[PDB]
Scaffold this active site. Structure first.
Site, short mmCIF file in Angstrom:
data_model
loop_
_atom_site.label_atom_id
_atom_site.label_comp_id
_atom_site.label_asym_id
_atom_site.label_seq_id
_atom_site.Cartn_x
_atom_site.Cartn_y
_atom_site.Cartn_z
N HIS B 149 0.70 -1.41 0.04
CA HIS B 149 0.06 0.12 -0.15
C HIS B 149 1.00 1.32 0.03
O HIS B 149 0.29 2.27 0.00
CB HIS B 149 -1.13 -0.25 1.24
CG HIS B 149 -0.42 0.32 2.44
ND1 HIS B 149 0.03 -0.53 3.33
CD2 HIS B 149 -0.34 1.66 3.05
CE1 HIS B 149 0.37 0.13 4.48
NE2 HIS B 149 0.27 1.40 4.28
N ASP B 198 -0.93 -7.18 1.18
CA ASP B 198 -0.39 -5.64 1.27
C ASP B 198 1.09 -5.97 1.20
O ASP B 198 1.90 -5.24 2.18
CB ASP B 198 -0.78 -5.09 2.69
CG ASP B 198 -0.56 -3.56 2.54
OD1 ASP B 198 0.04 -3.17 1.64
OD2 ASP B 198 -1.11 -2.76 3.35
N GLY B 292 5.93 3.85 12.95
CA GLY B 292 5.08 3.47 11.98
C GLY B 292 5.84 3.71 10.46
O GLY B 292 6.32 4.69 10.32
N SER B 294 5.35 1.18 7.55
CA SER B 294 4.47 0.37 6.54
C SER B 294 5.64 -0.47 5.71
O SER B 294 5.60 -0.25 4.55
CB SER B 294 3.97 1.69 5.77
OG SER B 294 2.51 1.53 6.01
N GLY B 295 6.10 -1.38 6.55
CA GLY B 295 7.26 -1.89 5.63
C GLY B 295 8.37 -2.36 6.31
O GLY B 295 8.94 -3.17 6.09
#
Ligand SMILES: *[C@@H]1O[C@H](CO)[C@@H](O)[C@H](O)[C@H]1NC(C)=O
Ligand SMILES: *[C@@H]1O[C@H](CO)[C@@H](O)[C@H](O)[C@H]1NC(C)=O
Lengths: 199, 345
Positions: B149, B198, B292, B294-295
């Site tokens: 995402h 995702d 945070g 995201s990966g």
């Protein structure tokens, strides 16, 4: 009965009456004929009779001991906030209006992946086995030398209604953490009794 | 149909009659079969090692060699046998993944000391127009994993996807200081409702180096048997409290695994967590570690060697009550990548 060994763990010595192992005490285990014996079974906490603790239903000769003994502050209120809760849809709890000064229960309408107003409060599912112990106000404490069990635990999700948000009360199924048994053995209700020979 | 397995890297071999994966005994194997076996699972110009090891995998139908026949393929010469003739089986390493400098006090998710350089040697940072956005983890010099995402629409073309590795600080990745773009594969089933799948691979044209700050993380094996409350080590520059921007330095402290039945119950996450979604964190109050990214991955350390298990994904409010993080499940499709890494060459 085997909770009462001098200096032990268990239920009765930890959350009912902690037998002190320092003074010059002397312990007595006696009996009583059950012709005229009426076990009084009264709850000693203030903040459970403040929120509608009436009594236990046990038999004529059953003694209600304790398992866990949770302590709250003075501003405790086990009902949710009704002026917040109306816009909740998912997981929406019961509520009522707290008495004066008793601060409300902390309830959020935080956001899911799609749903935006879904209810999430503290003290779930029950404070015996809460997932976040550092946030429910009912703190679990062990009873001390010469103290009473400071209150049965309240399940926070049976305290309230929907329409008439009255003064915040609760409901008789919601007080949890007690069990019992019968005292009668050999046709005679056994009884413990301590002595303390101070000075 | 060939795959790695477990901690000691046994090749399993699928046969259509036995309907099952099976190991190969080491009866006259060669690098001319073995170093030409890493291109079967998407490793063209790399190899590390191969040895003989003791059988403990758990099949009673082995695979043997048809060396009595002439010059045929590897994939023709494999019949069954009940016994290994030298009792050595496939041991493999397709790349120099694994180790770091075992250092001590890297804990800079909130309340700790910084990630020491070289001890997390797979940590990358991905950029568009030179702002730090998403992370990832290397498994080849040419491939790189990240959360899908980040590469969603309308930013789904590869020429604006600049990787930048190496430097803990927010500054020193300059133009030229970091290799750059190529192919953006995706697991093509990302959704808006679920965020199932995702995880999107990315590719680079220019192979980088295993020098000091850069080393490929180990992708897990099919069926590698985690532990239900295992320790897990995440990393990333993420904002430690929400409505922030980015932390300055690399932050690499630790978290734990929550199981399904706690997350997927009624109070945490009301029956959302798919098989291709793994929960993580600690189901507690404000003790969690957000950062945070995201990966920014989930790296565990089973068999005393770092392995990759989860890449990050969505969540709830940053590191607070009842609300853990939910991670992409990168042992589910470690072979889908291996059939999307086979045919880039
Ligand atoms: C029980 O009560 C009755 C009347 O209340 C009394 O006469 C009797 O003595 C009591 N029983 C015993 C054993 O004292
Ligand atoms: C205990 O008392 C309540 C109210 O008197 C009653 O509903 C309940 O059935 C009683 N318990 C038993 C076991 O009958």
């Amino acid at each position: 009965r085997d909770d009462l060994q001098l200096g032990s763990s268990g239920f009765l010595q930890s959350s009912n009456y902690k037998i002190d192992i320092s003074s010059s005490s002397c312990q007595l285990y006696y009996s009583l004929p059950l012709v005229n014996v009426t076990i009084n079974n009264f709850n000693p906490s203030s903040w459970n009779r403040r929120y509608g603790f009436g009594s236990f239903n046990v038999s004529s000769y059953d003694v209600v001991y304790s398992d866990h003994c949770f302590s709250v502050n003075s501003d405790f209120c086990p009902c949710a906030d009704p002026s917040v809760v109306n816009s909740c849809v998912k997981s929406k709890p019961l509520s009522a209006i707290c008495p004066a000064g008793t601060k409300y229960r902390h309830c959020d309408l935080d956001t899911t992946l799609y749903v935006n107003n879904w209810c999430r409060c503290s003290c779930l599912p029950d404070p015996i086995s809460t997932y976040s112990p550092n946030t429910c106000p009912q703190k679990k404490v062990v009873v001390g030398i010469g103290e009473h069990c400071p209150g049965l635990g309240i399940n926070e999700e049976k305290c309230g209604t929907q329409l008439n948000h009255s003064s915040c009360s609760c409901s008789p199924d919601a007080f949890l953490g007690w069990s019992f048994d019968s005292c009668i053995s050999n046709n005679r209700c056994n009884i413990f009794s301590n002595f303390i020979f101070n000075g | 149909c060939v795959r790695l397995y477990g901690p000691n890297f046994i090749l399993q071999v699928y046969s259509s009659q036995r309907k099952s994966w099976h190991p190969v005994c080491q009866d006259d194997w060669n690098e001319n079969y073995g170093r030409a076996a890493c291109r079967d699972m998407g490793y063209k110009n790399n190899f590390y090692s191969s040895q003989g090891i003791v059988d403990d995998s758990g099949s009673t139908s082995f695979m043997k060699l048809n060396t009595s026949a002439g010059n045929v393929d590897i994939y023709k010469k494999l019949y069954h046998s009940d016994a290994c003739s030298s009792k050595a089986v496939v041991s493999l390493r397709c790349i120099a993944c694994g180790v770091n400098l075992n250092s001590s006090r890297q804990s800079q998710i909130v309340g700790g000391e910084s990630a020491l350089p070289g001890a997390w040697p797979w940590q990358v940072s991905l950029h568009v127009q030179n702002v730090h956005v998403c992370g990832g983890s290397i498994i080849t010099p040419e491939w790189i994993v990240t959360a899908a995402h980040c590469v969603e629409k309308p930013l789904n073309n590869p020429w604006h996807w600049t990787a930048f590795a190496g430097i803990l600080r927010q500054s020193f990745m300059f133009y030229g200081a970091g290799y750059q773009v190529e192919k953006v594969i995706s697991h093509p089933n990302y959704d808006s409702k679920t965020k199932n799948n995702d995880i999107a691979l990315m590719k680079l044209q220019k192979p980088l180096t295993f020098n000091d700050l850069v080393k490929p993380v180990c992708l897990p094996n099919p069926g590698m048997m985690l532990q239900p409350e295992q320790l897990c080590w995440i990393s990333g520059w993420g904002a430690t409290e929400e409505k922030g921007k980015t932390s300055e330095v690399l932050n690499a402290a630790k978290v734990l695994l929550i199981e399904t039945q706690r997350c997927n119950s009624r109070y945490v996450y009301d029956n959302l967590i798919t098989p291709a979604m793994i929960c993580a964190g600690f189901l507690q109050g404000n003790v969690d570690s957000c950062q945070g990214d995201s990966g920014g991955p989930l790296v565990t350390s089973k068999n005393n060697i770092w392995w990759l298990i989860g890449d990050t994904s969505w969540g709830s409010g940053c590191a607070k009550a009842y609300r853990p993080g939910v991670y992409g499940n990168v042992m589910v499709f470690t072979d889908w990548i291996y059939r999307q890494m086979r045919a880039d060459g």
